[PDB]
Amino acid sequence: NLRVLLDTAIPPSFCDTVSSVLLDDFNMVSLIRTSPADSLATIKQDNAEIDIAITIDEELKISRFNQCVLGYTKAFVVAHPQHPLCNASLHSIASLANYRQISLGSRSGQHSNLLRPVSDKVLFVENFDDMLRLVEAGVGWGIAPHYFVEERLRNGTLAVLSELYEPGGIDTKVYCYYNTALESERSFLRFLESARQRLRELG
Amino acid sequence: NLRVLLDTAIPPSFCDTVSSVLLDDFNMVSLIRTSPADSLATIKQDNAEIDIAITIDEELKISRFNQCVLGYTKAFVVAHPQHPLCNASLHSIASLANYRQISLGSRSGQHSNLLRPVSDKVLFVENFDDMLRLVEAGVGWGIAPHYFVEERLRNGTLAVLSELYEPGGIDTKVYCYYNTALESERSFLRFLESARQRLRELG
Numbered sequence: 537n538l539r540v541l542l543d544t545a546i547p548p549s550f551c552d553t554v555s556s557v558l559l560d561d562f563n564m565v566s567l568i569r570t571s572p573a574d575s576l577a578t579i580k581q582d583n584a585e586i587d588i589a590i591t592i593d594e595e596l597k598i599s600r601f602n603q604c605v606l607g608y609t610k611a612f613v614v615a616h617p618q619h620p621l622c623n624a625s626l627h628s629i630a631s632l633a634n635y636r637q638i639s640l641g642s643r644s645g646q647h648s649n650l651l652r653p654v655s656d657k658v659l660f661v662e663n664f665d666d667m668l669r670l671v672e673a674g675v676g677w678g679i680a681p682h683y684f685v686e687e688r689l690r691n692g693t694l695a696v697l698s699e700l701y702e703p704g705g706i707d708t709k710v711y712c713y714y715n716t717a718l719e720s721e722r723s724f725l726r727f728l729e730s731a732r733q734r735l736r737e738l739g
Numbered sequence: 740n741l742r743v744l745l746d747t748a749i750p751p752s753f754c755d756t757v758s759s760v761l762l763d764d765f766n767m768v769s770l771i772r773t774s775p776a777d778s779l780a781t782i783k784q785d786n787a788e789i790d791i792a793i794t795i796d797e798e799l800k801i802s803r804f805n806q807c808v809l810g811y812t813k814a815f816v817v818a819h820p821q822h823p824l825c826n827a828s829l830h831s832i833a834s835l836a837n838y839r840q841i842s843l844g845s846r847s848g849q850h851s852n853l854l855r856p857v858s859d860k861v862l863f864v865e866n867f868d869d870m871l872r873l874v875e876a877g878v879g880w881g882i883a884p885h886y887f888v889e890e891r892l893r894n895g896t897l898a899v900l901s902e903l904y905e906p907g908g909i910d911t912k913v914y915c916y917y918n919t920a921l922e923s924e925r926s927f928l929r930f931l932e933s934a935r936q937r938l939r940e941l942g
């Protein structure tokens with residue numbers, strides 16, 4: 537019986553790539569979604585008995601847990617197209633610290649360097665849906681995964697601010713945190729191989 | 740008159756891409772090499788009067804300085820091919836904390852999250868040459884830029900440990916830190932455009 541944690545920044549297309557592989561080898565595979573803000577916090581509770589976390593969050597090192605890289609994924613800074621930063625201050629880039637950010641909150645109340653808010657005017661939410669709902673309402677700007685802003689950018693509901701900072705979207709590593717135990721069995725290695733190929737072609 | 744800082748992790752091929760561009764627009768262009776460990780430390784001294792830093796090091800935000808991404812570059816974990824971690828513990832990956840690291844020292848004595856050593860047994864050096872000299876001598880392992888370990892890996896002098904952690908080498912963003920002043924003049928934007936194209940095709 538195996539527990540796997542995917543944060544809500546991992547496209548749910550990926551979430552199949554593993555699932556088809558892991559059931560070849562394992563009898564029971566439990567998939568658990570979490571805020572990227574909650575991914576590392578969670579696996580650090582032993583009682584949670586997580587054996588794999590796919591998350592964008594980075595941490596020096598965790599107890600009974602090895603890190604590797606599965607691949608890369610995109611994120612944009614988005615705001616309401618009428619937003620002061622659309623074009624008028626767009627070239628400014630570092631203006632973001634002065635406008636209100638819609639940031640993912642953490643249950644733990646504290647954040648990594650990566651996912652810590654950058655503005656002093658912050659409004660915390662649990663998930664990317666809440667974030668973008670508020671961002672469409674012109675309440676603030678936010679950083680969301682590509683799969684969450686695809687539709688809205690085509691619709692013109694949302695506008696990108698990040699293109700000058702990082703053309704093509706903000707490249708973000710996807711880490712695999714894995715219980716040290718798995719490091720030997722060919723099963724885990726099959727999963728990595730597939731998972732890597734299967735997220736390579738999603739670019 | 741314009742001062743530009745390239746850390747020693749930026750391939751010196753790149754270091755031309757800019758230089759050909761910047762002299763179209765500027766009359767005097769001063770190129771300054773620094774340890775990636777010293778790049779941000781340096782520009783934070785106003786008396787240094789740096790107007791651009793190309794560095795792999797990341798920092799939340801700097802005074803009178805905006806950040807953007809020029810592109811990506813490779814880094815490998817290397818050790819002497821006889822090294823205990825070649826193959827015998829290679830799959831271990833997190834063993835690195837237990838073997839001696841050859842880390843870039845900083846003049847400032849302190850390091851970013853990114854460039855901070857990961858082993859407790861550290862041996863600091865000024866530059867990647869010293870690092871690899873010691874790594875060939877089997878004294879410890881180290882993380883070096885691709886351009887520095889190309890030859891030695893073909894020669895078999897050095898071996899990669901990083902391939903399971905991150906197939907293809909460790910992707911590392913190259914940031915451009917730029918004095919806020921430049922954000923308006925078309926000159927800087929020409930430089931970014933070129934610099935981005937010119938580092939894209941170096942992959």
Ligand SMILES: CC(C)(C)c1nc(Cn2cnc3ccc(Cl)cc3c2=O)cs1
Nearest residue numbers: 545610611613650651654679680681708
């Ligand atoms: C603050 C600024 C410049 C906009 C950046 N911040 C990050 C760090 N960061 C944060 N939140 C994210 C959420 C989802 C995803 Cl998919 C990625 C990120 C991310 O990289 C980078 S670039």
Ligand SMILES: CC(C)(C)c1nc(Cn2cnc3ccc(Cl)cc3c2=O)cs1
Nearest residue numbers: 748813814816853854857882883884911
């Ligand atoms: C500790 C470990 C797992 C091996 C990693 N550390 C980094 C962070 N890091 C550090 N030193 C570097 C030097 C040159 C270059 Cl080109 C890149 C790096 C780098 O990414 C990543 S992966």
